[PDB]
Design a protein around this nucleic acid. Structure first.
Lengths: 262, 124, 185, 37
RNA sequence: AAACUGCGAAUGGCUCAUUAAAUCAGUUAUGGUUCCUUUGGUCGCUCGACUUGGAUAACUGUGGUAAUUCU
RNA sequence: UGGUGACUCUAGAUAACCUCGGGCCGAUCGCACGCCCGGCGGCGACGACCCAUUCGAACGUCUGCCCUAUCAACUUUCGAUGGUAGUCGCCGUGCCUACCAUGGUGACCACGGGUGACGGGGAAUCAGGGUUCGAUUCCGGAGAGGGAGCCUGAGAAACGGCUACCACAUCCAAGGAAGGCAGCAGGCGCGCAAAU
RNA sequence: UCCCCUGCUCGGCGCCGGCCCGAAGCGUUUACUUUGAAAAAA
């Protein structure tokens, strides 16, 4: 390869893009943006598979540049725009908004939210920088460079930004006893409380997260998103509240639903 | 007789049309033509009979069911703005050019072979 | 890089001994008893029974009180109850290996058509299925190797298009009626 | 916009520096208390 | 339409000749460097014209070579 | 000021530099209309030094490749091993220069040769262990007759880009001019062997 | 089938300069063994 790739095969797509095999050779390669290729979700994939508003690749384009869809308060006219974690998407005419949260399994889930919760967005700070004339800077996980932050924002905190002004309203400090969830790996979408944080000099610093029912698991430092201060979550959690039901309880719940439905 | 039960209804305010799946139950008859099921969707969904577009009819084994797609728009010109043109060619509301691909490719190559004003005249 | 399937497998196996007396007598007895066409069908039933027995043995050699053992064991028992080769009394993993080709062969649609009384012989049941006369839960079946479930046993009746269960008469009826009209004038 | 955000950051930095200085003086007083008692 | 300007042709497709710690696979690092496009920030921070210049296309006219997506 | 396990890190101050083949600090375009005494406004499109991000690429760390002793020693001022100081390169580095010391690998198989060797995810058979294959749809690498050199461009030693060599080859008024199907169809040769 | 037989510089679960709990930071090294992270899809 003499340059960057511009195509992407269907079976080379990530599994959480949640496609089929016998439809086409290629898959939608997203345009470059705030999020990585294997951690985002194209707008065409959502509008054509999840919401079922469109069936072909031209109907998605018509809806997309018809100026009907707004992305974090800004209208976007790219059908392969990368949408990732807590990307607030809004439809102005039928009055629906969706928040992208990983569910109990390894995928995205549709989650309708009220507009009052659609005005803000929780996002994770990545690194702290100092500008030219002594301006402190923040680099956010969706590449939002924010000037003049609060002095108590550290490396692995979570800030809440209003989508109309771009400023910080409130923040959550990285500490034990806070509600957390994991973004990537074998664990995905489980909601838990940070207990331990093991420090290894020169490598990945693993942590330990306990679920609300008695389960525990260990993830890396980069696989951390802090969502709450204590037990109350700052956003509306999806169905099941991220408990990671095992296969026996899942089978029992499906059998109970089948017996009750008839 | 033949009767219709629509399935998987939804509306689409993003594109001013109504998605549903139509299953056609015709015991003893053949496959229904698309015009007559368009008249049934007209007399059922209280709209004009020239705005409804149906396609994708697939018969079942034994000949009792026939499921497929069918779309109802709010108005005729709203349907003309956002629809594939070949379905309008099926329904007689559109005409397309009858030129083959090799003739167009040869004309494009012969236009590439010359420069200037003569490009518009070498290809007829 | 065309987008196709390229996924296939063989459903039957051929024994290593081609010419033995007792084996050929046993498959001939099975074929002549249950009205089958060739030995490929009983070979494929032997293949799927060997697969089920191998899966049950692989689950039995794993230790007790493990979630995978319980999950695949209860899945296999629910599946084989749904076929109808077992009852709820023998709902055990070790009772899977005491099965037979006979229990898998009684669940054929041809055997059920002959057993209930739609047909007079097993070969007549096969050719009755082949001319599209037998339907179940409002869907006609034209194939004899259909595995009916336990809940699907009581829905077996004649079709609404077959002349046997009420419908348009066939080719020989209308031809003999036209011949009678020609003879009568 | 630059002048407004610079003024707001200067005010917030002054408040947080005053709070940190008060906590440092409290820690110095605690050290003096544990030295005396 | 033509043509100037800008962008893409370095993607895709076909083959297995070379290559035996070379390629590649898992695991690390760039605190040892460049990065089209998109995204966010910066874009009156510097103390010193109510819009400037001439060249080429396309076009017109006139030609050579037996011959070119030539001039 | 702020951070890392760790800076000759970022920020701050002083004194200067700032390349004529020269860093930026807008001599660009469209829609809807306008308030307040000629000045003054809303939403966009394009372009731009720097900074992070996205797509990556590239160089390195640890471990793992088929056969052969009728290959037992190999490399070494035609860089082989390391040190100093430089050139060049986007960066470290004998990558290359000038000077120093004789170093480095090897019976735990180096080196040399062969391969009907692209590598892996995988396929066949299979009680338990194994044996054989993997040109072939997804990933990475290499080439467009075969070596060599280069313009443009962010990214090419590109070949449906260019320049000379040889093998082969087209047209011609004989002066010259024009090319590389291991792309899709198709044809010849080669064949036991493979389509519009 | 349950619990007990490596030492030391700062603090929150409790009290009246005195006790327990925890922790910035260190504890003879290997193979073997069990768990955890990550380990593209098909």
């Amino acid at each position: 390869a003499r340059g960057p790739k511009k195509h992407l095969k269907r079976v080379a797509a990530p599994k959480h893009w949640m496609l089929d095999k016998l439809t086409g050779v290629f898959a939608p390669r997203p345009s470059t943006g705030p999020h990585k290729l294997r951690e985002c979700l194209p707008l065409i994939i959502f509008l054509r598979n999840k919401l079922k508003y469109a069936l072909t690749g031209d109907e998605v384009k018509k809806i997309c540049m018809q100026r009907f869809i707004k992305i974090d308060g800004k209208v976007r006219a790219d059908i392969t725009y990368p949408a990732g974690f807590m990307d607030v998407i809004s439809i102005d005419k039928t009055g629906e908004n969706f928040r992208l949260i990983y569910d109990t399994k390894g995928r995205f889930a549709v989650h309708r939210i009220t507009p009052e919760e659609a005005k803000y967005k929780l996002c994770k700070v990545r690194k702290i920088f100092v500008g030219t004339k002594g301006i402190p800077h923040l680099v956010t996980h969706d590449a939002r460079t924010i000037r003049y932050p609060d002095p108590l924002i550290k490396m692995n905190d979570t800030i809440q930004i209003d989508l109309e002004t771009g400023k910080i309203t409130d923040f959550i400090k990285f500490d034990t006893g806070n509600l957390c969830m994991v973004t990537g790996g074998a664990n995905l979408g489980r909601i838990g409380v940070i207990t331990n944080r093991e420090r290894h000099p020169g490598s990945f610093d693993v942590v330990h997260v306990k679920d609300a029912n008695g389960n525990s698991f260990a993830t890396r430092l980069s696989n951390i998103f802090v969502i709450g201060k204590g037990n109350k979550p700052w956003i509306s959690l999806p169905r099941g509240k991220g408990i990671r039901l095992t296969i026996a309880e899942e089978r029992d719940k499906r059998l109970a639903a089948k017996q009750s439905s008839g | 007789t033949v009767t219709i039960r629509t399935r998987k209804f939804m509306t689409n305010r993003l594109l001013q049309r109504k998605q549903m799946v139509i299953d056609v139950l015709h015991p003893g008859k053949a496959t229904v033509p698309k015009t007559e099921i368009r008249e049934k969707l007209a007399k059922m969904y209280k709209t004009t009979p020239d705005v409804i577009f149906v396609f994708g009819f697939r018969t079942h084994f034994g000949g009792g069911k026939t499921t497929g797609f069918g779309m109802i728009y709010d108005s005729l010109d709203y349907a003309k703005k956002n629809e594939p043109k070949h379905r309008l060619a099926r329904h007689g509301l559109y005409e397309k050019k009858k030129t083959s691909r090799k003739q167009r490719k040869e004309r494009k190559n012969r236009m590439k072979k010359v420069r200037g004003t003569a490009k518009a005249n070498v290809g007829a | 890089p065309v987008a196709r399937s390229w996924v296939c497998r063989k459903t039957y196996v051929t024994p290593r001994r081609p010419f033995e007396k007792s084996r050929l007598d046993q498959e001939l007895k099975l074929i002549g008893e249950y009205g089958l066409r060739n030995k490929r069908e009983v070979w494929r039933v032997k293949f799927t029974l060997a697969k089920i027995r191998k899966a049950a043995r692989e689950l039995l050699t794993l230790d007790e009180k493990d979630p995978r053992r319980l999950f695949e064991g209860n899945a296999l028992l629910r599946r084989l109850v749904r076929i109808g080769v077992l009852d709820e009394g023998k709902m055990k993993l070790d009772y899977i290996l005491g099965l037979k080709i006979e229990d898998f062969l009684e669940r054929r649609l041809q055997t059920q058509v002959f057993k209930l009384g739609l047909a007079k012989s097993i070969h007549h049941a096969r050719v009755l299925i082949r001319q599209r006369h037998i339907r179940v839960r409002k869907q006609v079946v034209n194939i004899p190797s259909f595995i009916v479930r336990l809940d699907s046993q009581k829905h077996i009746d004649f079709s609404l298009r077959s002349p046997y269960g009420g419908g348009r008469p066939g080719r020989v009826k209308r031809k003999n009626a036209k011949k009678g009209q020609g003879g009568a004038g | 916009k630059n002048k407004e955000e610079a003024a707001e950051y200067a005010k917030l930095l002054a408040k947080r520096m005053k709070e940190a200085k008060e906590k440092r003086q409290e820690q110095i007083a605690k050290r003096r208390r544990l030295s005396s008692l």
